Amino acid sequence: KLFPKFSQALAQDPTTRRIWFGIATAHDFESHDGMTEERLYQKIFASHFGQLAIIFLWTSGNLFHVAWQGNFEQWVQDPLHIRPIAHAIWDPHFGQPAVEAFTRGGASGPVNISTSGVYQWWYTIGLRTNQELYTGSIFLLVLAALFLFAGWLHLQPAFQPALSWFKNAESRLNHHLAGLFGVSSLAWTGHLVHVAIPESRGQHVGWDNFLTVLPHPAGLTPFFTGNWAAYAENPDSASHVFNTAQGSGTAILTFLGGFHPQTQSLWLTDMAHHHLAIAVIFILAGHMYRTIFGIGHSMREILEAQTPPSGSLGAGHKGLYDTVNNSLHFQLGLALASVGTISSLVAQHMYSLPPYAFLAQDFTTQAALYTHHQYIAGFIMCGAFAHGAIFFVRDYDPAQNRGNVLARILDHKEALISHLSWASLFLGFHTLGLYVHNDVVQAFGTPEKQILIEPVFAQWIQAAHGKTAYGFDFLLSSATSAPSLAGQALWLPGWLQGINSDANSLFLTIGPGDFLVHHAIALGLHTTTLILVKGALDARGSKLMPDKKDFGYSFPCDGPGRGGTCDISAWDAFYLAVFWMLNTIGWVTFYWHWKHLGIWQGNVNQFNESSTYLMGWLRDYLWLNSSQLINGYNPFGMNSLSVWAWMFLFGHLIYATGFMFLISWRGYWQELIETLAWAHERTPLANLVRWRDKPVALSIVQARLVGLTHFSVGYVLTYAAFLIASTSGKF
Amino acid sequence: LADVNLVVGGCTVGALALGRFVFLPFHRASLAKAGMPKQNGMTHLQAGDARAEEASFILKTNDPAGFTVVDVMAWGALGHAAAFYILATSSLGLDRNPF
Amino acid sequence: TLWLPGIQAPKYLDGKLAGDYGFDPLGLGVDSDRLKWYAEAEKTNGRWAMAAVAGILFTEILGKAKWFEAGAQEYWMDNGPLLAVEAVIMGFLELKRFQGWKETGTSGFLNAFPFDPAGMNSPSMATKEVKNGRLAMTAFVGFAVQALLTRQGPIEALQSHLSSPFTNNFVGSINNLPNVIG
Amino acid sequence: RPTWYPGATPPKYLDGTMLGDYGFDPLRLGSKDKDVLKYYREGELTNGRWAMAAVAGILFTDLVGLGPWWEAGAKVESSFDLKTLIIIEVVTFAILEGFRVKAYEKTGETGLGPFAPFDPLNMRSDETRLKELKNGRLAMLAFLGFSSQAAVQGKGPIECLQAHLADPGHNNIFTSSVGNEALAAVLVLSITPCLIEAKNRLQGTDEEEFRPLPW
Amino acid sequence: MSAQFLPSILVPLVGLVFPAVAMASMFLYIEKEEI
Amino acid sequence: SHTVKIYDTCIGCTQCVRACPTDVLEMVPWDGCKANQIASAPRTEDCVGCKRCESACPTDFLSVRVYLGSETTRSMGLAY
Amino acid sequence: MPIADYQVFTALFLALATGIFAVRLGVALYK
C-alpha cells in the first residue's frame, strides 16, 4: 500500500493504477512529496553518476564480449573477408539446423554477426589484440565502479554540494569547454599520435613500450621552436596498406583530406590534427566566463546587453539568464535539441565521410549505424520539444519574462502555428500531388509525362564543393577560382578526388527522385515541428481551455463538454508528434537505404527511375528487398536470416498490438474488467484467492503511452530486421 | 621560422604592454559593467557557493594601475598564442594564397 | 609572510596549521572539514614523497638499479604475491591510520595517536614536517618528469647538469630526447 | 571486543549475546528473526562438526602414507555392494538425524541418539561451546582449503605444506592457475573494510530499510 | 571461446533465477503495506 | 478526492447541481449574482470526475471547475 | 590468442564488486 513512497497520493490508490503510475512517475522528482530544490539537484547529480556507470558498463561489456567470443584477431588480419562477431549464442531452444545456421565467422558455436561497427572503430583506434580489449573492459569496469562510488559519495551530507554550486553556470561552462571538451580532445590527439598512428603503420605501441618509442623522429623540438610544419613532412602514400609499414611515413599531423585509398576512410593523421585544433579552440572557449579570478564574462550581463533598440525584440533577452538557470526543463530542452541535432550530424557524416578503417565496405554496418543515429536523433528532438512544453507548463514565469523574446514568441504564437500549418499543407499537397501524378502517368504507360523537377539548387551547392558533374564551374568546381587556388596544396586534391569519385558516399549524384523525397522529408520535419511547437505554445492555455497551465503538462482531457476535448494537453501533442517523427525518420532511412542499395549493387538507375513514383518505392524497394528476409525460415528449412524474419513478424505484431491501445479507448475495457471481476469474485474454487489491488482499465494517458510505446517498438524492430536482413543477406 | 626566442618574447612583451597601457581602461570598464555573475539577483557567492568566492590573491596588488597576476597570465597566454600562430604559419612553405 | 607580497589571506593565518601562507588561489579550504582532511592528506603525501626521495637517493648513491626501472628487476618473490602481501599489510596499516583519524584528528601509526615517542614535538616542528614534505613532493615530481625525458637518475642528472649547465638544462633535454629514446 | 576486522562496527542485532559474535554478517541472512537465526547457528555447528571430522580423517589418512583423500574412493575394496551400502547409510543417517531433529526441537540444541544433551564425560559450559564453534569454523575453512588444493594442485595437504616450505616465494596461492583471481580478491578485500569505515564516517549506522535479501 | 560452461550457467541465472527472484521480490515490496 | 471549485462568475442557474450524478454540488446563499445563489462543493469525496457539471455551465468561461487528482474507490467508480 | 579462464573469472568478480557499488548507489538514491 506504501510502494510509491515518493507520492502518497498514488499510494492511497487501491487499484492497479497505483503501481502503473508508480512505475511511470518515479523519475518526475519535481512532483514528489517533500521535495526541495537542493534535494532535487543532488538526486539529479547522483542519477547522472548512475547513468555514466551504466554507459561505461555497457561499453565494457561490448569489449569483453568481443574479446571473449568475437573474432577480432581474425578480423584484423582479413577485414574484408571476415564477418565481425558480436557475442556467442547460448539458447537452449535452438534446434540443430539453427545451431548450424548461426555458426558463421569461424567460431566454435552459434554467434551473432555484429553490425554495430565496434570492430572497425577499435581497429582504427589502434586496438589489435583481444588482450587489449580485455584490458579496456577491465579498466572501464573499475572506472564505472569509481563513478558509482562518487555517486554514493556526493549524496552524503558531508559531500553534498550546495544548490548555488549547481547553478554556477559560468564555472560549469568554463570547465566543460576547457576540460571536458578541450582536454579530452587533446588527450585523444595524444592517443592517436602515440598509439593509433604507429599501429596504423605496423608499429605496435603499448603501455610497455610507449615511453621508449618516438611518435615523430624530431621529438618535441619542432613543437617548441614553432617549426610545426615538421610534423606534416611525409604523409602516408596512396599505396599505403593499413596495419603494415609498407609505404607509410613519419608525419603525425597531415592535412590531405579525402579518404585513404585502401580503407576508404579518413586519414588518421587528419584526425589527430583535427582533434588538436578542436582541443585548442575548446580550451580557448573554456577561458571565456568569469569565475573567481577577476576576469571573464557574466553571461547575465551579456543577455542584458543583447537588446536591440526601437523595440524590435521587445525587452530583448531581459532575464533569460535566470529563466534558463532556474528551469531544469529549459536546460534539458536545449541539451536534447543540440544532442539530437548532433546525432543527426553524426549520421549524415559517418556514411559520407567514413571515419573508421574498412568502413563503407561493411554495407550492413553503415546502414545500421545511420538508421540507429537517425532514430535516436528523432526521439531526442521530440524529447526536447516535450521538455520545452513542460517548461512552459511548469517553470515559465510571465513576470520575469515580461517583454523578452519568450514573451514575444508567446504573444504571436498563432502566427507561428498558422505558418507552420501553411508550410506543412503546401509540402503535403505538392509532394503528394507530384507523386500521385507520377504514379498515374507511370500506370497509363507514359513515363514521359512525369513531373521531374531537377534539384538545381542542391546540385549548385554540390558544384560549389567541386563536383564537376552538372557543369556549373562555380567555386571549387573551377580550379581558377580563389577558393580552389587557396587550398590547392592543402585539402583540395584529396577532397576533389573524393567528391569526383562515384565509388563513395561523398555527396552522391542527385536527381528528381531525390527532389521529391527531400520535399517528403521537409513535409515530415515541418509537420512534426508544427505538432510539437503547437503543443508547447498552447501548453499554458488555448481558447478551448484557457486554464490549461493549472491542469499540468499531462492529463486525459476536459470532458465531452464544449464540443469535446480529447487529446488537449501538451503531452498529447508530443504523443501525436511521435508518430510523425517515426514517419519522417522512416522516409529518411528508406531514402538512404534505397539509394545506397542502388549504389552498392552498381545500379543507381533502379533508384533513379523508380523513386520518382510510389509504386517503384513499394515494388523495387519494399517488395524486392524483402524476398530473402521472409525466406529466413520456410517449410524447406531455415538459414541465418531466420532471426530477422522472426523479428520482422515480431515488430508487425507489436505494431498492431499498439494499434489496439491506439484505437480502442478506456470504457469498453473498464466494463469488461468489471464483468471479469464479477466472474472471479464468485467462481467456485477460485474465491480462496483475491486481488490485493483492484483490477482497473488502464487510464487514458497511460494507454496512449502504451500504444505509442508498442507502435515505436514495432516500427523500430520491423525496420531494423528488414534493413539488416536485406543488406547482410545480400552483402 | 625566424627564431622562436625573439618572436615569442617580443609577442609576449607586446601583449603585456598593450594589456597594461592600451587595453587596460576598456577592460576595466567592461569588468565594472559586467561585474559579478549574478543568479536570481545576488551573486553566486551570496547564494551559498563558497567555491565562487573571489580569490584574495587578485584583490590587492602593489601595481599602481591594479594589473594583477591573472591579467598578466591572460595577456601572456594571448601573446604566446599569437607568437606560436605566426611561427607555425611561417614554418609551412606552401601556397596558401588564392592566386 | 605570504606567497605574494601585497595580498591578504582569505581564511588562513599563523594561529592555525603548519607551514601556513596565503597560498590557496583556487580556494579549496572553504570547508573546514575539507581543510583539515586536505591537511592530513598533505602530511601523508609529504611523508610518502619524503620516504620515496630518501630511498631513491640512497639507492642511487649505493648503485643498484635506477628508481624508475627497479620494478622490472627480478626479486625473490613474484610481482603478484608481492603486490598481494603489500596490499594486505598496508590495507591493515591504512585502516588503522583512518580509524585513528576517526576519533582524534591527528596522524599516527598502529595504536599510537599521535605516534610521538620520546617527545620532540612542537608547533615549530610541525612547520618543519610540512615544508620538507612540500620540498619532497616537488622533488619527486622533478625526479619523475626528469626520468620521463632523460633516462637517468636524479644524481646522474645533477652531475650532467654540473658538467654543463648551458646545454644540459631542461631545454637541452628536449633536444636530447630524439637521441636518448629510440 | 574483537570483530571480523579491526575496529569494525557490528550490526545492531549482533549485539554480542550469541557465542562467536565477531559482528560479521554483511549479507544479513538472520536479521529480522531470531528462530531462523538459531537455525543458522545449528546449521553452522553441524557443518563445523562434520568438517572437524572430515579434516581429522583427511589429515590422518594423508599422514600415515595412504594416497590422496579424494582418490581414496576407488582405493577401498571390501564386501557389501554399493546399493546395499547406500541403503544402509541412508537408513542409518535417517534414524540418527531424526533423533537429532527431536533433540533440537526439544532442547534447542542438538544431541547424539536418544540423549538430547549427550555428555557422559560432563564438559558442558559456555566457554567450551565457543571453543567448539571456533574450531568448527577453522576446520570448515581448512576443508575448503583442502578441496581447493585438490582442485588446483595435484598434491595432498601435507604435500602442499611441504611444497610451500620448499619455496614459499614461488609456490603459493598467487601463481598462474587461480593466482590472478586470488590477487583480485585480495586487492578488493584489502580495501573494502576501509570502505565500510568510510560509509560509517559519511553515512553512519542508522539502520537502512533494505537488506541484501529482499526484506 | 574459453570457459564454455559459463554461458550455460549464467544464461539460466539471468533468465530464470534472477528474474524470478526479482519479480517475487518486487511483488512482495509493492504490497508491503508498512515498509 | 477530486478538486471541485466554484468561482464568482457563477450566475446561480443550478444546472451544475442538477447535472451531478453523485450529489457533490449544492446551492448556498450568496449576494454576488442576480439569482442570490452560488454553487458549492461540500462532498468532493463523492466526486467521480465525470465533468457533467462543466458540460452544464453556461458561463463563459465555466464557473464549476473540476481538477482530477487523487483516486479512491469512489473516484474510480468501482462496484467491486 | 583468445583470453583465458582466469581473465573471465577475474572480470566476473570485478563485475560483482561494481554490482555491490551499484546497489550501494541505488540504496543511497532511494534514501
Ligand code: CLA
Ligand atoms: C574540467 C573539469 C570538469 C570535467 C572534466 C567535468 C566532467 C563531467 N561533468 Mg562536471 N562540473 C565541473 C567540472 C568538470 N566536469 C564544475 C567546475 C562544476 C560546477 C560548476 C561541474 C558540475 C557538473 C554537474 C552538475 C554535472 C556535471 C556532469 C559531468 C559529466 C558529464 C556527462 C558526460 O560524461 O558526458 C560526456 C560529454 C562529452 C564526452 C562531450 C562530447 C561532446 C559531444 C556530445 C559528443 C561528440 C564527441 C565525439 C564526436 C564523440 C565520439 C566518441 C565515439 C567514438 C564513442 C562529465 C564526466 C554531469 C554528470 O554526469 O554528473 C556526474 C552533471 O550532472 N558536472
Ligand code: CLA
Ligand atoms: C594530453 C595528451 C598527451 C600526453 C599525456 C602526452 C604524453 C607524452 N608525450 Mg605527447 N603529444 C601530444 C599529446 C600528449 N602527449 C600532442 C597533442 C602532440 C602533437 C601531435 C604530441 C607530440 C609528441 C611528440 C613529438 C613527443 C611526445 C612525447 C611524449 C612523452 C614524453 C613527455 C614529453 O613530451 O615531455 C614533456 C613535455 C613538457 C615538459 C611540456 C608540457 C607542458 C605543456 C606545454 C603545458 C601543459 C598544459 C597541458 C594542457 C597539460 C595537459 C595535462 C594532461 C596530460 C592531462 C609523454 C608520455 C615525446 C616522446 O618521447 O614520446 C614517448 C615526443 O617525442 N608527444
Ligand code: CLA
Ligand atoms: C536526457 C533525457 C531525458 C530526461 C532526463 C528526461 C526526464 C524526464 N522526463 Mg522525458 N523525454 C525524453 C528525454 C528525457 N526525459 C525523450 C527523448 C522523450 C521523447 C521520447 C521524452 C518524453 C517525455 C514525456 C512525454 C514526458 C517526459 C517526462 C519526464 C519527467 C518524468 C520522467 C517520468 O515520466 O518517469 C519515468 C519514465 C519512464 C519510466 C519511461 C517509461 C518507459 C517507456 C515509455 C517504455 C520503454 C519500453 C521499452 C523500449 C521496451 C523494450 C522493447 C523490447 C522489449 C522489444 C522527467 C523529469 C514526463 C513529465 O515531464 O511529467 C509531466 C512526461 O510526461 N518525457
Ligand code: CLA
Ligand atoms: C496484433 C495486435 C493485437 C493483438 C495481439 C490483440 C490481442 C487481443 N485482443 Mg485486440 N485489437 C487490436 C489488435 C490486437 N489485439 C486492434 C488494432 C483493435 C482495435 C480495433 C483491437 C480491439 C480489441 C477489442 C475490442 C477486444 C480485443 C480483444 C483481444 C484479446 C482477445 C483474447 C485472445 O485473443 O486470446 C489470446 C491472446 C492472444 C492471441 C494474444 C497473443 C498471445 C500469444 C499468441 C500467446 C501468449 C504467449 C506469451 C507471449 C508468452 C509470455 C512471454 C513472457 C516473456 C511475457 C487479445 C489478447 C478482446 C478482449 O478483450 O478479450 C476477449 C476485445 O474485446 N481487441
Ligand code: CLA
Ligand atoms: C550492460 C552490458 C552487458 C550486457 C547487455 C550483457 C549481455 C549478456 N551477457 Mg555479459 N558481461 C558484461 C556486460 C554485459 N553483458 C561485462 C562488463 C562482463 C565482464 C564481467 C560480462 C561477462 C559475461 C559473461 C562471462 C557472460 C556474459 C553473458 C551475456 C549474455 C547472457 C547474459 C548472461 O547470462 O550473463 C550474465 C552477465 C553478467 C553476470 C555480468 C553483466 C553485468 C552487467 C554490466 C549488468 C549491467 C546492467 C545495466 C547497466 C542496467 C540494467 C538493469 C539491470 C541491473 C536489471 C548476454 C547477451 C554470457 C554469454 O556469453 O552468453 C553466451 C556469459 O557467460 N557476460
Ligand SMILES: CC1=C(/C=C/C(C)=C\C=C\C(C)=C\C=C\C=C(C)\C=C\C=C(C)\C=C\C2=C(C)CCCC2(C)C)C(C)(C)CCC1
Ligand atoms: C520547445 C521549447 C524549447 C525548445 C526549442 C527547440 C527544440 C529549438 C530548436 C532548434 C534547432 C534544432 C535548431 C537547429 C539549428 C542550427 C542552426 C539554426 C544553424 C546555423 C547556422 C548557419 C548560418 C550555417 C552556415 C553554414 C552552412 C550553411 C554550412 C557550412 C558552414 C556555414 C557556416 C557556411 C525551449 C526549451 C528552448 C524553450 C521552451 C520551448
Ligand code: SF4
Ligand atoms: S452551472 Fe455554472 S453558473 Fe450554473 S450554478 Fe453551476 S457553477 Fe453556477
